Each structure stands twice: as C-alpha cells, then as structure tokens.
Amino acid sequence: ATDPNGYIVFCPCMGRFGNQVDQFLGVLAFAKALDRTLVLPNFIEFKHPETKMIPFEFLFQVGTVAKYTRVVTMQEFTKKIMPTVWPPEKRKAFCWTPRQEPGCHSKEGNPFGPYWDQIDVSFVGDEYFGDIPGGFDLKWLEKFPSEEYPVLAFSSAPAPFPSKGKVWSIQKYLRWSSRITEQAKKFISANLAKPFVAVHLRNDADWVRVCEHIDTTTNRPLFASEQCLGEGHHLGTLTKEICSPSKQQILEQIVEKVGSIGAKSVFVASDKDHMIDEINEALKPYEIEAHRQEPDDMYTSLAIMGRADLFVGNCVSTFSHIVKRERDHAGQSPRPSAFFGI
Amino acid sequence: ATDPNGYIVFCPCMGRFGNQVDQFLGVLAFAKALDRTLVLPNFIEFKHPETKMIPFEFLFQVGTVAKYTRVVTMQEFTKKIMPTVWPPEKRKAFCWTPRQEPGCHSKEGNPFGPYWDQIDVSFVGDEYFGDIPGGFDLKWLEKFPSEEYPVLAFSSAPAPFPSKGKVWSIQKYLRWSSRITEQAKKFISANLAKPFVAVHLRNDADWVRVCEHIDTTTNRPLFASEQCLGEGHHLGTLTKEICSPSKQQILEQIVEKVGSIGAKSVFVASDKDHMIDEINEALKPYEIEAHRQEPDDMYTSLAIMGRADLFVGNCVSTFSHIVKRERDHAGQSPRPSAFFGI
Ligand SMILES: Nc1nc2c(ncn2[C@@H]2O[C@H](COP(=O)(O)OP(=O)(O)O)[C@@H](O)[C@H]2O)c(=O)[nH]1
Ligand SMILES: Nc1nc2c(ncn2[C@@H]2O[C@H](COP(=O)(O)OP(=O)(O)O)[C@@H](O)[C@H]2O)c(=O)[nH]1
Ligand SMILES: [Mn+2]
Ligand SMILES: [Mn+2]
C-alpha cells in the first residue's frame, strides 16, 4: 500500500553537493513534521558537459535514513507510486508565492529543467504556501489534504539555507553507501598510516573571490561559517584568513596538527590545489607524507575525512560542514575536528 | 534633514500595473510598520519596444499618499538623499534567502535590470530576512539598524501577492494626479451623460488562456478573485464565466445594469476588444451609446471608472481591483460596483 498521508518530492536545485545536503537535512525535518513520506532526491553534479543526476542510494544508505523518517527511493516513487497516485493532470508545483504570468515557474533554468525532465515530470498548475503562518519552520494539513494533494512537489527545497543548528544532528542518518565506505576503507588501509590528519583545501579561483568579498563590519553568516563561529557569529568575526588561508598558514597549521596528535600520515581533499609537494616538504621533519586520491572523488573524499583521526576543515565551506556534522553525530560520541584560522 | 530611521526602496518588479499597485499597498503598510520612509517606486510599462519607468507622481499625488506614511519621491531620493546616505559601497540587496553562487541576484532579468539601471544602482552584497520570525507580515530593527543599514533595498516588493484584505483600504491614499483627474473629468463631461455605467472588458488572448486553466475543484484564489468571492473563496467558486464572460453574457449584463440605474451612457475600458458596435446595437432600445477613449489610456480609464455612477468589473483582474478599492475607499462612503458573472 502507499502512504495515505501522501508524499513530498523536491529538487535540491541550489548549489553544489554541500549546499544540496545542507538543504536536504532541513527537508528531512520538514517531511517528518508534515507526516508525509519523502521521495529521496537525486543529487546534482555540474562538472560534466551536462548536468547529471545521481540517485540518493548511490551515495547514502536508504536503511539508515529511514530510521529518521519515512522515505522512498526516486525509482520506487517514479515506477511504482507516481503513475496511479500522481498522474500528469494533478502535478502541481509548490512555491512560496507568485514570482516574475506570475507563478512558480518551476522548470525554467538549470538545474530546474533537467531535474524534472529526468523523471519525465511537467507541471500543470501552481499551489502557494507563503500565506501559511510560520512557513516551513514547523495548517499545512488544513490547506493541503492528502486526497486532493497526494504529492507536494517543490522545485526549491522547502528548507533554510544555510541550515539551522537544529537540523545538523540529522547528518547521523546519512551513512555512505557500502560502495563508498569500502573505497574509503581501502584507501586508508593502503595509503594512510594511523593516526592520520585529513584536511579540506577549498581553493579554486571562484572561492578566493567569495572570501575577498567578506564584509567584516556586518559580519553576517556566509555559507557554513556558523559551524565554527556559532549562530549569527556570536563567537567571533569571519575573516579572509579563515575563509581562504594563505599557503603559509595552511602549511604551518598542518604541521602543528601533525605534531599535536603524532600523525603518521596526512590526507588531502581539494577542489583544485592539493599542495602535495608543498605539504610533503613541510612534513619532512616528521618523515611522513600527504596523500590524495587521483582523481579526487568528492564522495569518497568526504567519507575518508569522516574516518580521520583528526579533521581540519574550511569553516565557510558547506562541503567541510558535511564532514563536521558526520564527525559530530554519526557515532555516539563526536570525533575531533578543527578549522583553518580558528 | 534626512530620516534617522532610514529608507526603504523597491522594484514593483512583478507583473503589469494592477499587480504593481496590488503589491505597493502591502509595501506602504510594511514601511509604516518599520517606521522607515518609503521611496515611492517608479511604475513599469511593458507595451513599448523597451521597458519604461513611470514616476509615481506622474500617476498619483504625493501629498495624499503622505497622509498614510512618510514618503519621498524617487527624484528626491536619487538626487538629494542617496549620494551621502547610501553611496555605492553600502548598496546591499535584500531578499528572503539565497537563491540559485547563491544570493539575491537582484538585477538579473527584466524588469529587474532596467529598473535599477534607470536610477544608476548596482548592488555590492546581500542581506537576508527570511530568518526573521513572521517575515514581512508585521526584530527587523534588531537585525537592520539605521546606522549600518540606512536603506533597505528590495528587488522584489516586500508584500504579499495577491494583496490581503487588510491593506485594501490603503487605496484611499492613492489619488490620481491632477493631470489624470482633469483628463477623466473632461472625457466624462464631453462624452458620458449621467448616470453612466463603466465596464472593464479584460479580453486579450493571454487572458482567455489564464481563465481556461481554472481548476474549479481546488478553487484557489486567482489574482484579484477574492475581491468578489471573499478570502479563500468563502463565498463561492471561481468559474470561467466569471473570469472570461462570453460576448453574449457581457451584452446581457450591460443592458441589465443600464436598465437598473436608468443609465444615459456607457463607458468601456478594454485591453483589446471594446465591443463598441456590439454594445451600441444592444443599447438601441435605450437610445444611449457606449464610448471609449482613443487610444485607451490605462490610467485615465481607471480614473473614469472610479468616477462612474456604477462600475462593472472583472473579478479576476487586478486592474479591475484598483477600481473596486478606489470606489470602496476613496470617499467616506463606498460607490457601487458589480462584477460580470456575480
Ligand atoms: N573533489 C573534490 N570536489 C570538491 C572538494 N571541495 C569542494 N569540491 C568541489 O566544489 C564544491 C562545493 O560547492 P558545495 O559542496 O556546495 O561546497 P562549498 O561550495 O564548498 O559550500 C563541491 O561539491 C566538489 O564538487 C574536494 O575536496 N574534492
Ligand atoms: N488600456 C487599457 N490597458 C489595459 C485594460 N486592462 C487590462 N490593460 C492592460 O493589461 C494589464 C493588466 O495586467 P495588470 O493591470 O497587472 O491586470 P490583470 O493582468 O488584469 O491582473 C493592464 O496594466 C494595461 O496595460 C484597459 O482597460 N485598458
Ligand atoms: Mn558553494
Ligand atoms: Mn496579469
């Protein structure tokens, strides 16, 4: 049987993987609060000639996320549930309010178009929820009953971004697929003498520009920055030094952390410059080396960093934030983490 | 001296004139609640080779709107206030939350680009307000103090659409410019024997398509439809017959209303087909005629309809809704109105 309360389906249609996971935690909480089954999203990759959709279960374990709230895979929804529960005629798009005729416009642009195209979904009308007192920070049952609205479909994730502290613990329920876990275990065993320090070096050209725009006087959250500076930055000011450490600062801090734990190796995950030769020179006095995956597979890198004896991340990066939350919440006790410039 | 509490400036960047006015009422209420001076928006026309900005005071009287809340013209803001109060470096865009790197993207598309271009404004950073409990349905003072944030700038009007019943009475404070008022008075005196019925015929091709999409089972508000069917349509179901009356239905109802008030003329405002010859044939038994402006000037048409002995509008149209609110609220007592199919 299908869920009498109905379903929620959405596109994680903002940003790259760290942003998608950040909003997905909020959506999980939203679905549980509404008591509707969540269709697990396809994640989205952009580093290809075309946008590419990745099934949830390629990356994470369905069994584990189900321990938080009721879920179904996109494949089950698409093949088994949709045809009778949600036929083309009742496929309505849900959004906050009409936007610039005025409506949700759920399939314009990228990845909005390709995401819904992938599952052969087009929308035939709009439903608005901006007038519901409190929005999605959980009337919804009053406004959208299951019989007429079996599926709530959102082209934008119905979740805050950046994520609120309240949902960070939901990362406990995102467990890497067995394939990724095994790839991580194998790389560690073959390459990384323990204890090892794992570091995230976020350093592509677009990033340095993001950091150089930091306005220290207004000191607002930027992406994941509350993971080290607290809600609304109550613990301090976000600086360029934290957002984009100098090569010198990276080396000094890696060497310090190697010393602090008696590390026997270093793992580096990077979007661009892994600094392997530079780190290796700096580590010569300790007779250990830094190691990277070739090529650098983002998911296996996240998994390796979650398994590290010590993780040093980038406080602003939502990609680092995945690792921080996993280390904080996957187990019964947190595994230690630090951040550059903190 | 300038307002120590600061300013609000915004683009009425959604839809045509009826939509812009509908959101402007909500923005007026918002500015009064925040106790900031409102920069009066340029309105936007699209029926030209390029988007065209119209100063507020070309259409409405500054003196009258000021009786509701503190306001300044765009010209005063732009020439006298902006240069010292809000220089390029502190021009931040305000939006609900980051949108697809993630941010407000306040100048992408049309009329967003041309609107801010017109006043030589570019933005250098973003501020978000989605995390403020209750949104803009008036913490704002706590989050955005006047000293650092002298000007809150919104690329989307910080107001509901369609407008809520609570702000409809603000139309009392939108009084046509003396130029428009005089044009209306002259047309009435020269052409329209009293008492006269004024009708709004919304009938361009795009409109009939809007109406044909009506889902009577879900019966949600569509544009201005709550002006005749009440909040959330508590009074009835929106039909195609109400949204887009047949020519036959238009004629029958005009003749009925002419009879009801002993009308000595009819005025027709239309976006497309004024039906003058057809209405004239139908009015032959009464020996009166229907009259239109050539060309049909939308603002003078609104003003004429506000002055009519009886107005028959289109319940779905936000353009008709301007007339309904003016007739309800400009004076001490409402002037009578009706709608096709109601
Ligand atoms: N491979 C690999 N790609 C990365 C790394 N770091 C950042 N990227 C890439 O750039 C992206 C990040 O944008 P998002 O994860 O949203 O993280 P933020 O942009 O860091 O908040 C990440 O999905 C990968 O695609 C890494 O360590 N490895
Ligand atoms: N001139 C003239 N233009 C009209 C009339 N009615 C609708 N239009 C045009 O089509 C537009 C309406 O879209 P908007 O006013 O937002 O009204 P809705 O689209 O009717 O909610 C209106 O601004 C004019 O530009 C009319 O009676 N006269
Ligand atoms: Mn990013
Ligand atoms: Mn319209």
Author numbering:
A (entry chain A), B (entry chain A): 25 to 124, 132 to 169, 177 to 380
Reproduce text from the manuscript describing this model.
POFUT1 α-fucosylates serines or threonines present in EGF repeats containing the appropriate consensus sequence, C2-X(4-5)-[S/T]-C3, where C2 and C3 are the second and third conserved cysteines. In the present study we have solved the first crystal structure of CePOFUT1, which serves as a conserved family member. The protein shows a typical GT-B fold formed by two Rossmann domains. A cavity for GDP-fucose is localised in the interface between the domains and a contiguous solvent exposed pocket for EGF repeats was identified by electrostatic and docking studies.
The fourth one is a crystal-form-III in complex with GDP, resembling a product complex. The structures show the typical GT-B folding and a non-metal dependency. We also determined the activity of CePOFUT1 in the presence of 1 and 5 mM MnCl2, showing that the enzyme is inhibited by manganese (between 40–60% inhibition, data not shown), contrary to what has previously been described. CePOFUT1 is a catalytically competent non manganese-dependent enzyme, transfering fucose to MmEGF12. Unlike Asp242 or Asp244, Arg240 played an important key role in binding and catalysis. The role of Arg240 is crucial in order to stabilize the charge of the incipient free phosphate group thus promoting its dissociation from the anomeric center.
